[PDB]
Write an enzyme that holds these catalytic residues in place. Structure first.
Site, PDB file in Angstrom:
ATOM      1  N   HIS A  61       0.855  -1.217   0.000  1.00 45.07           N
ATOM      2  CA  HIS A  61       0.000   0.000   0.000  1.00 45.07           C
ATOM      3  C   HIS A  61       0.865   1.232   0.000  1.00 45.07           C
ATOM      4  O   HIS A  61       0.670   2.177  -0.813  1.00 45.07           O
ATOM      5  CB  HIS A  61      -0.912   0.065   1.228  1.00 45.07           C
ATOM      6  CG  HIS A  61      -1.746  -1.129   1.384  1.00 45.07           C
ATOM      7  ND1 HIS A  61      -2.730  -1.428   0.547  1.00 45.07           N
ATOM      8  CD2 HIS A  61      -1.700  -2.127   2.319  1.00 45.07           C
ATOM      9  CE1 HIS A  61      -3.305  -2.594   0.905  1.00 45.07           C
ATOM     10  NE2 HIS A  61      -2.637  -3.049   1.969  1.00 45.07           N
ATOM     11  N   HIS A  91       5.555   6.109   6.959  1.00 50.24           N
ATOM     12  CA  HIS A  91       5.223   5.799   5.596  1.00 50.24           C
ATOM     13  C   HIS A  91       4.831   7.070   4.896  1.00 50.24           C
ATOM     14  O   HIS A  91       4.732   8.120   5.502  1.00 50.24           O
ATOM     15  CB  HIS A  91       4.058   4.764   5.511  1.00 50.24           C
ATOM     16  CG  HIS A  91       2.822   5.308   6.160  1.00 50.24           C
ATOM     17  ND1 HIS A  91       2.546   5.176   7.486  1.00 50.24           N
ATOM     18  CD2 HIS A  91       1.782   6.041   5.592  1.00 50.24           C
ATOM     19  CE1 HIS A  91       1.437   5.877   7.743  1.00 50.24           C
ATOM     20  NE2 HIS A  91       0.943   6.424   6.598  1.00 50.24           N
ATOM     21  N   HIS A  93       2.342   8.895   1.498  1.00 55.13           N
ATOM     22  CA  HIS A  93       1.332   8.867   0.467  1.00 55.13           C
ATOM     23  C   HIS A  93       1.786   9.803  -0.617  1.00 55.13           C
ATOM     24  O   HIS A  93       2.314  10.859  -0.321  1.00 55.13           O
ATOM     25  CB  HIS A  93      -0.033   9.354   1.008  1.00 55.13           C
ATOM     26  CG  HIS A  93      -0.428   8.564   2.240  1.00 55.13           C
ATOM     27  ND1 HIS A  93      -1.252   7.468   2.189  1.00 55.13           N
ATOM     28  CD2 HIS A  93      -0.118   8.722   3.564  1.00 55.13           C
ATOM     29  CE1 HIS A  93      -1.441   6.985   3.390  1.00 55.13           C
ATOM     30  NE2 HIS A  93      -0.744   7.737   4.277  1.00 55.13           N
ATOM     31  N   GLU A 103      -2.767  13.661   1.644  1.00 54.42           N
ATOM     32  CA  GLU A 103      -4.066  13.286   2.213  1.00 54.42           C
ATOM     33  C   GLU A 103      -4.727  14.496   2.815  1.00 54.42           C
ATOM     34  O   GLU A 103      -5.818  14.890   2.377  1.00 54.42           O
ATOM     35  CB  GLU A 103      -3.831  12.141   3.222  1.00 54.42           C
ATOM     36  CG  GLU A 103      -3.344  10.887   2.512  1.00 54.42           C
ATOM     37  CD  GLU A 103      -3.647   9.650   3.250  1.00 54.42           C
ATOM     38  OE1 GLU A 103      -3.366   9.562   4.470  1.00 54.42           O
ATOM     39  OE2 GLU A 103      -4.207   8.731   2.612  1.00 54.42           O
ATOM     40  N   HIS A 116       3.902  10.400   7.107  1.00 56.86           N
ATOM     41  CA  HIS A 116       3.209  10.112   8.364  1.00 56.86           C
ATOM     42  C   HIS A 116       4.080   9.322   9.274  1.00 56.86           C
ATOM     43  O   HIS A 116       4.526   8.213   8.915  1.00 56.86           O
ATOM     44  CB  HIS A 116       1.946   9.310   8.090  1.00 56.86           C
ATOM     45  CG  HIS A 116       0.902  10.135   7.403  1.00 56.86           C
ATOM     46  ND1 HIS A 116      -0.153   9.567   6.690  1.00 56.86           N
ATOM     47  CD2 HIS A 116       0.728  11.499   7.386  1.00 56.86           C
ATOM     48  CE1 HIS A 116      -0.920  10.594   6.237  1.00 56.86           C
ATOM     49  NE2 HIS A 116      -0.380  11.736   6.653  1.00 56.86           N
ATOM     50  N   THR A 195      -6.102   6.643   8.030  1.00 57.23           N
ATOM     51  CA  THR A 195      -6.592   6.927   6.665  1.00 57.23           C
ATOM     52  C   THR A 195      -6.616   5.721   5.776  1.00 57.23           C
ATOM     53  O   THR A 195      -6.935   5.847   4.591  1.00 57.23           O
ATOM     54  CB  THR A 195      -5.778   8.052   6.010  1.00 57.23           C
ATOM     55  OG1 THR A 195      -4.462   7.510   5.719  1.00 57.23           O
ATOM     56  CG2 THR A 195      -5.741   9.311   6.863  1.00 57.23           C
TER      57      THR A 195
END
Ligand SMILES: NS(=O)(=O)c1c(F)c(F)c(S(=O)(=O)CCO)c(NC2CCCCCCC2)c1F
Ligand SMILES: [Zn+2]
Length: 257
Positions: A61, A91, A93, A103, A116, A195
Site C-alpha cells: 500500500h 510511511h 502517500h 491526504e 506520516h 486513513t
C-alpha cells in the site's frame, strides 16, 4: 481486498469498514483562516535522538520504515498530547503527478506527498490495544513539495529498488528520522482516524505547517514502486492517498498565530 484502485479504492472501503462514514474520519481539508490559534497548545516535543530504525518494508500500500518500539527510544509528547507516544513506523502517500498525493489539504491545496510518522500511546501498552482507544495513536504529518532534494530522505530513496514489490523488506538500521523534519514545528491538530482500513477513530493528528522539499528525482523513485507482488502485472504504486473527509463536528486548532 482494499486498495487505491477504482475497483478497490476509498469510495468502496465503507462496505468492509463501515466507520469509513464515521464522525471523526481523516484526512480533512485544513481551512487556515478557520483553524483557531490555541494559546494553550504546548510546544510539541519530538525526541528521536535514540531511534533505532530496524527495517523498511513494502507493504503493498505504501512502504513503511520500522522502529523498535519495545522501549521509550523515539517518542512524541507535548503539543496537544497527554502522555508519551512511541514511534512505530513511517510511511508516505504520494501522487502520479506533483499536483496530488497528500491526504490532508491546506485551503484545498494538495501537496505532492505526505509523510506520516505513526506513534502509539504508552498508557495502552501495545499498538493493537491503542487502536481501540480515542487517544490511542498520534500521527505526525509532514507535507512534501517538489523542489530541492531532502538529503535525509536520500537514504530511504536509495533502497526502494530493493523493496520494489509487495512483501519485500530490507534491513534499515541507523536511519535518523530527524532528517525528514522541517525547521518549524508549528502545527495544526484535530481528532481523527487512520486513513487506511481499518479506519479506526483512534488518532490525534498533528500536521506540520511547513512542508519539506524533495526533488523530482526522489519522488520519481517513490513512483517506481509497485503495489503488486512480484509475478503479477506491474501496477505502479501511485495515488495511494485517501481524499479529504467531512469535518463534521470538529475544530482544527493551530499552535501558531
Ligand atoms: N495514514 S495512517 O497513518 O493512518 C496509516 C497508513 F496510511 C498506512 F498506510 C499504514 S501502513 O503503512 O501500516 C499500511 C496499513 O495497511 C498505517 N499503519 C498503522 C495502521 C494500520 C493498523 C495497524 C496498526 C499500526 C499501523 C497507518 F497508520
Ligand atoms: Zn498515512
Amino acid at each position: 481486498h482494499w486498495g487505491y484502485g477504482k475497483h478497490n479504492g476509498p469510495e468502496h472501503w465503507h462496505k468492509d469498514f463501515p466507520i469509513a462514514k464515521g464522525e471523526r474520519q481523516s484526512p480533512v481539508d485544513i481551512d487556515t483562516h478557520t483553524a483557531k490559534y490555541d494559546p494553550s497548545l504546548k510546544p510539541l516535543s519530538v525526541s528521536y535522538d535514540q531511534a533505532t530504525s530496524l527495517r523498511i518494508l513494502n507493504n503493498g500500500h505504501s512502504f513503511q520504515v520500522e522502529f523498535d518500539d519495545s522501549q521509550d527510544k523515539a517518542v512524541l509528547k507535548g503539543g496537544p498530547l497527554d502522555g508519551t507516544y512511541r514511534l512505530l513506523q513511517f510511511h508516505f502517500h504520494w501522487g502520479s503527478l506533483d499536483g496530488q498525493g497528500s491526504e490532508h489539504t491546506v485551503d484545498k491545496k494538495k501537496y505532492a506527498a505526505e509523510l506520516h510518522l505513526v506513534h502509539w500511546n504508552t498508557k495502552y501498552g501495545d499498538v493493537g490495544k491503542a487502536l481501540q482507544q480515542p487517544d490511542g495513536l498520534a500521527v505526525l504529518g509532514i507535507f512534501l513539495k517538489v523542489g530541492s532534494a531532502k538529503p535525509g530522505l536520500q537514504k530511504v530513496v536509495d533502497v526502494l529498488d530493493s523493496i520494489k514489490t509487495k512483501g519485500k523488506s530490507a534491513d534499515f538500521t541507523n536511519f535518523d528520522p530527524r532528517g525528514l523534519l522541517p525547521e518549524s514545528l508549528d502545527y495544526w491538530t484535530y481528532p481523527g482516524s487512520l486513513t487506511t482500513p481499518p479506519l479506526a477513530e483512534c488518532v490525534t493528528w498533528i500536521v506540520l505547517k511547513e512542508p519539506i522539499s524533495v526533488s523530482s528525482e526522489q519522488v520519481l523513485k517513490f513512483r517506481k514502486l509497485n503495489f503488486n507482488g512480484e509475478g503479477e502485472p506491474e501496477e505502479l504504486m501511485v495515488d495511494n492517498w485517501r481524499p479529504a473527509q467531512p469535518l463534521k463536528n470538529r475544530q482544527i486548532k493551530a499552535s501558531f498565530k
